[PDB]
């Protein structure tokens, strides 16, 4: 192409310059890792997932028989958080709303020992759940770097995770999230605030048109402030920049 790689790099920091954080987004092409941001070490860094982990979650539930695709959790009818989650869904709503209540109901039926095990079997991040099963992804013990998301996205993207093909296919579903002239974005948002500074995820890949499969993960610093559409219009400006989407 004709811009230069100093251009582009330039132009993906001044992204996250102008939302006045500090973050970086990896993104893989075949097996070449690039690194981009304002904040180039955080890439081996370790951040709790926070509902990035949903993806996981959703992945073991699904295939030790904890939940189908089409099974409806029920609002318990307690205050939630935000209003969207009060409200009865699937994992696939719930994975789109990011329904942390209905994802602690499914880890609460995998339950700490077989999560431990499949975790541990997925090699996802540090690979720690600690003695809580219903909030280790949230405030610890478990932690993984952009690195380690990126290669999780592109595992999941390819099929490469060790689930049945279907299990795969079925989570997939539930992470569209954009189109744009013939690509798909799939990916889980996350942003942790019971740790301290607060941590904000986006994971996932593009499909292009003709098939192939590009991961990405951001990672940034949220601040009370900002908005979590932050996280989406960095990613999408810097795909863009780049010539993916
Ligand atoms: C996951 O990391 C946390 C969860 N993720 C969120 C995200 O934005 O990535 C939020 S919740 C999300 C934003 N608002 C939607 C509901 N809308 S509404 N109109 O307010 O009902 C859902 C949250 C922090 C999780 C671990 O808590």
Redesign the pocket.
Known sequence: MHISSQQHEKAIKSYFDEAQTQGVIIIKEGKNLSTYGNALARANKEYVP???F?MLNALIGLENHKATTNEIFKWDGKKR?????EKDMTLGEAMA????PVYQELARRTGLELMQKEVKRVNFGNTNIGTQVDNF??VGPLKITPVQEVNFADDLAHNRLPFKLETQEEVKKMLLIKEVNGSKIYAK?????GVTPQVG?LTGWVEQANGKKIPFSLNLEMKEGMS?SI?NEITYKSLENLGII
């Open positions: 926070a509902s990035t949903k958080t935000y209003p969207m989650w709303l990011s329904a942390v992804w949230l948002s996350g942003w942790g605030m995820w979590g996280r």
